[PDB]
Write a protein that binds this ligand. Structure first.
Ligand SMILES: [Mg+2]
Ligand SMILES: [Zn+2]
Lengths: 205, 336, 69, 50, 123, 32, 100, 98
RNA sequence: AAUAG
DNA sequence: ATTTTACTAACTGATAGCGGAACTTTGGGACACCCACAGGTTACGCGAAAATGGC
DNA sequence: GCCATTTTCGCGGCTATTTTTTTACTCCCAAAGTTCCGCTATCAGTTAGTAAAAT
């Protein structure tokens, strides 16, 4: 990166000014190296302005640690930075590098952190069985209804279908009537809400 | 379902066929939104959505749009487990030698090319030239030239010969080999040989050559031009409690490879002095070697924890490797 | 299970035949040919094999008869 | 300097979580001598004679 | 002990090439040579001549036909490199391969199962 | 088959049995 | 979760003839895993038959055992026919009795 | 300790380890050797696939047991897919033939 | 690392 | 004559779109002179096989 | 050109249970892309009211 900066410095040197090449080239080499550090030194990339904020926070915290003898609390750092304390806390927690999954846990040496990380995206088999049971119960309840109401509810909720449907295309079935489809859906819900045919589905709440 | 497992070399076309996209940036996730960055090591356009049946846009966000690629983002509406199966690729700016086929003794490249490993490393490390196309000249293929000698004979002959230096030279030497001709030559020389040492050498090399002919593999596939990239969910970057993140070392190794490749491309675009370009090519080779097998070439690359990074060879091998820890024995349910 | 291995000859073959019979009594609607005596399908199948009622050839013959019908 | 001292006092192999089942456990732990640790031997590499 | 010694005596070095597809001074499996010799005798042609070799249990394990078992044992890099350059094919005939791929082992209760497959591939 | 008393059956993994049989006692191991 | 009495009766009916696999590390030979019929006991410790201890190299000075439940019918019949302790009373290494 | 079903690993998709994590016992190499010596192929396949890392198979097995069917439909362990992916990432074409 | 078998 | 229900219109919330200014983010530049680095390490041991050296 | 000697390479038991780590640091500016609050406007759903019908 310093070599690239040096080439850029050679591209724009001016010997008429009388200064020597090191004087001008040092600035460009420094800039190239430090921009490269700002852009490529972290697994999660931090923008350059936040990198400067973090570095100057570290410098101020080190000067205050020398000054008072104990770690500077966030409000004192905020007052010295002329920035809000919430911004200080933001900068503080976004300035931590990711931990390795090969790091041992506790005092062990054959243990690794990655061996203790769950898969939170998985679905519990109890939940899958409950979903299958709910599907079966809903099918049985729908079987106790008039075929028109069962089909209307199926289209309006997407049961056994790829997509859900609004009142317009449900009306498009036989009679394109939003107010009618709405009434028959209400009737179907009222009959399904009767305690005679709802004790099976009540257990799933 | 399947009756056998077949192993062999991977061609650049095969590696491209495995890939669902090209990783162009070393970016992983945004530092505020924690969303994958485009063309990065965790791109959803390459490896798949981060939520089931959603796109990074949030526009297509149900099963009604399954299999539809969002025009704003490019993320396919499918499941998230596809991020455990979808691979990517990196188009290397310069060819890189594969460390297993170079330093796992005996060296396959050296055995095939009948040149000592030290000479091969000298050509690779940009210390010595080698003749690729001798032309109408007394020069022979595989003969080493120093920079002084190369300049001398470049003035002497000109464009009659081609001499190269690096992994491109080894790839050109391996691509120009006539395998059936070599097999016939070793058979003829074995017919009229008496020494048992030379007999052993020619029988080993003949076995390698006829194995290459029979397998359909090409020798130049031992030099990498396209580098495969593992699925992100096998090298996860997952949040811990308190905002901390746990990552795999493969992300560090891949980021090093991508950064050095991009710097090589930028140096070649700037028409840099040859010393800088040679340095960058050495560093690219070192980074790829560290990614594949850390510690085989030399000093093992270490992370911030001052310990060597774990590479793919370490993933698959050893007492703590995948074969013995997870395949020949497992943790089981319904146990106490 | 000495009687069962004597009637079959091979322990692995006995395991396979008893598994088929137990699946017939559990997943299928087939009924036991011996008093159940509050026993699980595996033990019922083993008892049937010991009594000589169930063999591999008998199972194949009954499957062929079911296919014919 | 603080990093060095915290490293030694919290992450060293010889800085051990105190045994505190009973008074004897504490006394024995404080009077314990290890051949391991930084600059010492290793379990697998140690031989019969030592 | 005799079973272990049998697994120790599994390779042969060919001394006479004959007409079979074997080179002199080549260490190959004995069963392959025996099958080839039976075929050539059925064809009435010169059989191969071999000297049997005794290998240690580690070397014999590393020199098996299947690269899955050899890689799972030790020296994974060497085994995988040799298999990759050679272009080897693993038929999954032993216990370790079928354990790794999740299939029934070709022993005991699974034995018959595998036999059935060997019939279907034959047909 | 020593564990069963009769002739060995087809499909018996005798190599694993041999290896375990040899390996298990390894701890006990040190002219008229 | 509420541990009703009918749950205990159901548990008895479930384990009535379901064999369970007992294991002790290190498993130096195949007699380190054997199948038993479980008898439900009040307590937190597994009760092991004395005559099998020599097979397990197990003594009651702090030893711990692992337990596995065969699920499918084939696994249950394998536990009953092959791995059951009454089948394995001879040493596969020598043929001598192991339950002495 | 006892467990029937619980948390699983992020990469290997295998049950976690430890009483603190409600994990499962490890069926190591020597246990597999014991099962091979017995000849219990189906018990071993249960341990390898539907109890550890066959994601679809283990859910199907739980549903079957809840339905009182006691049958399994084994599949490919996820650890083998991971192994295939890493070997491919090492620039080596490893594949399954039918 | 320490501890139990 | 009264009660239940079906029809219809109005309210309201969600939502897609847009404006625009603040906010985050990226790329360029800096002219006394400065001109070859680490950088801890290791008391292993054993057997094989592979690479060097001897005449 | 084979016979011996030195140099790498890979290996060293299985199950459990207790527990995170820690150095190193410029600034400013102009230009560009993105976000966050507020407002609009449309559609669909919900709800209240009233007439139509039935008891
Ligand atoms: Mg004890
Ligand atoms: Zn989108």
């Amino acid at each position: 990166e310093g070599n690239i900066g040096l080439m850029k410095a050679v591209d724009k040197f001016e010997y008429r000014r009388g200064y020597k090449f090191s004087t001008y080239a040092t600035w460009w080499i420094r800039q190239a190296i430090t921009r490269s550090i700002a852009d490529q030194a972290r697994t999660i990339r931090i923008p350059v302005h936040m990198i400067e904020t973090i570095n100057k926070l570290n410098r101020i915290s080190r000067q205050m640690l020398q000054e008072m003898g104990r770690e500077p609390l966030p409000e004192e750092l905020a007052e010295r930075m002329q920035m809000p304390e919430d911004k200080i806390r933001k900068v503080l927690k976004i300035a931590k590098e990711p931990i390795s999954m090969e790091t041992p846990i506790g005092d062990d040496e054959d243990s690794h952190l990655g061996d203790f990380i769950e898969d939170t995206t998985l679905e519990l088999p109890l939940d899958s069985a409950t979903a299958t049971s709910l599907k079966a119960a809903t099918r049985d309840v729908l079987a106790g209804l008039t075929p028109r109401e069962a089909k209307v509810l199926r289209m309006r909720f997407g049961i056994d279908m790829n997509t859900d449907h609004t009142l317009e295309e449900v009306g498009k079935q036989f009679d394109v009537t939003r107010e009618r489809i709405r009434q028959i859906e209400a009737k179907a819900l009222r009959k399904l809400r009767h305690p005679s045919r709802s004790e099976v589905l009540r257990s799933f709440l | 379902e399947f009756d056998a497992i077949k192993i062999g070399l991977a061609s650049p076309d095969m590696i491209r066929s495995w890939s669902f996209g090209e990783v162009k940036k070393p970016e992983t996730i945004n530092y505020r939104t924690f969303k994958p960055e485009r063309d990065g090591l965790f791109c959803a356009r390459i490896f798949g959505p981060v939520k089931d049946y959603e796109c990074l846009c949030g526009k297509y966000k149900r099963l009604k749009h399954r299999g539809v690629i969002c025009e704003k983002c490019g993320v396919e509406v499918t499941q998230t487990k596809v991020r455990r199966d979808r691979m990517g690729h990196i188009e290397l700016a310069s060819p890189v030698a594969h460390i297993w086929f170079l330093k796992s003794l005996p060296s396959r490249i050296g055995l095939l090319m009948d040149m000592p490993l030290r000479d091969i490393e000298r050509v690779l490390y940009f210390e010595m030239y080698v003749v690729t196309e001798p032309g109408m000249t007394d020069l022979e293929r595989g003969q080493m030239l120093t920079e002084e000698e190369y300049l001398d004979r470049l003035e002497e002959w000109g464009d009659e010969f081609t001499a190269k230096m690096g992994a491109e030279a080894i790839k050109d030497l391996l691509a120009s080999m006539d395998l059936p001709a070599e097999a016939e030559q070793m058979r003829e020389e074995l017919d009229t040989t008496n020494s048992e040492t030379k007999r052993k050498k020619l029988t080993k090399r003949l076995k390698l050559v006829e194995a290459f002919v029979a397998s359909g593999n090409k020798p130049e596939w031992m030099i990498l031009t396209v580098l495969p990239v593992l699925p992100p969910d096998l090298r996860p970057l997952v949040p811990l409690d308190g905002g901390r993140f746990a990552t795999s070392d493969l992300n560090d190794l891949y980021r090093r490879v991508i950064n050095r490749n991009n710097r090589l491309k930028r140096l070649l675009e700037l028409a840099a002095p040859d010393i800088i370009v040679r340095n960058e090519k050495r560093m690219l080779q070192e980074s790829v070697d560290a990614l594949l097998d850390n510690g085989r070439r030399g000093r093992a690359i270490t992370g911030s924890n001052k310990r060597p990074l774990k590479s793919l060879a370490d993933m698959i091998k050893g007492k703590q490797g995948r074969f013995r820890q997870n395949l020949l024995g497992k943790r089981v349910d319904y146990s106490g | 299970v000495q009687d069962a291995v004597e009637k079959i000859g091979n322990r692995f073959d006995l395991v396979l035949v008893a598994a088929r019979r137990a699946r017939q009594m559990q997943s299928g609607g087939k009924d036991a040919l011996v008093p159940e005596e509050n026993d699980k399908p595996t033990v019922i199948a083993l008892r049937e094999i010991e009594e000589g009622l169930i063999t591999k050839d008998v199972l194949d013959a009954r499957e062929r008869q079911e296919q014919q019908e | 300097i603080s990093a060095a001292v915290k490293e030694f006092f919290g992450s060293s192999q010889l800085s051990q979580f105190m045994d505190q089942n009973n008074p004897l456990s504490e006394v024995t732990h404080k009077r314990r001598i290890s051949a391991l640790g930084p600059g010492g031997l290793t379990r697998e590499r140690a031989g019969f004679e030592v | 002990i005799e079973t272990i010694v049998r697994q120790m005596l599994r390779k042969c070095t060919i001394t006479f090439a004959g007409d079979s597809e074997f080179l002199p001074g080549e260490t190959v499996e004995y069963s392959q040579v025996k099958i080839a010799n039976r075929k050539l005798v059925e064809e009435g042609k010169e059989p191969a001549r071999f000297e049997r070799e005794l290998l240690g249990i580690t070397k014999a394990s590393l020199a098996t036909e299947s690269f899955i078992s050899a890689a799972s044992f030790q020296e994974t890099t060497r085994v995988l490199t040799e298999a990759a350059v050679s272009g080897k094919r693993d038929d999954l005939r032993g216990l370790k391969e079928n354990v790794i791929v999740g299939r029934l082992i070709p022993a005991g209760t699974g034995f018959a199962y595998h036999q059935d497959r060997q019939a279907k591939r034959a047909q | 088959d020593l564990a069963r008393g009769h002739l060995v059956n087809q499909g018996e993994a005798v190599g694993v049995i041999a290896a375990q049989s040899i390996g298990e006692p390894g701890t006990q191991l040190t002219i008229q | 979760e509420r541990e009703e009495a009918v749950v205990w009766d159901i548990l008895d009916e479930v384990i009535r003839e379901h064999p369970v696999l007992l294991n002790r590390a290190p498993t130096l030979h195949r007699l380190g895993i054997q199948a038993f019929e479980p008898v439900l006991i009040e307590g937190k410790a597994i009760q092991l038959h004395p005559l099998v201890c020599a097979a397990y190299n197990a003594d009651f000075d702090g030893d711990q055992m692992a337990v596995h439940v065969p699920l499918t019918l084939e696994a249950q019949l394998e536990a009953r026919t092959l791995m059951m302790s009454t089948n394995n009373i001879l040493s596969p290494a020598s043929g001598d009795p192991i339950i002495v | 300790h006892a467990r029937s079903t619980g948390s699983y690993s992020l990469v290997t998709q295998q049950p976690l380890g430890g009483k603190a994590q409600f994990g499962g016992q490890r069926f190591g190499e020597m246990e597999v050797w014991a099962l091979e010596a017995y000849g219990a192929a189906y018990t071993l396949q249960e341990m390898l696939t539907v109890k550890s890392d066959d994601v679809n198979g283990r859910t199907k097995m739980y549903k079957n047991i809840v339905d009182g069917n006691h049958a399994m439909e084994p599949g490919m362990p996820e650890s083998f897919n991971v192994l295939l992916k890493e070997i491919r990432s090492l620039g080596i074409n490893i594949e399954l033939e039918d």
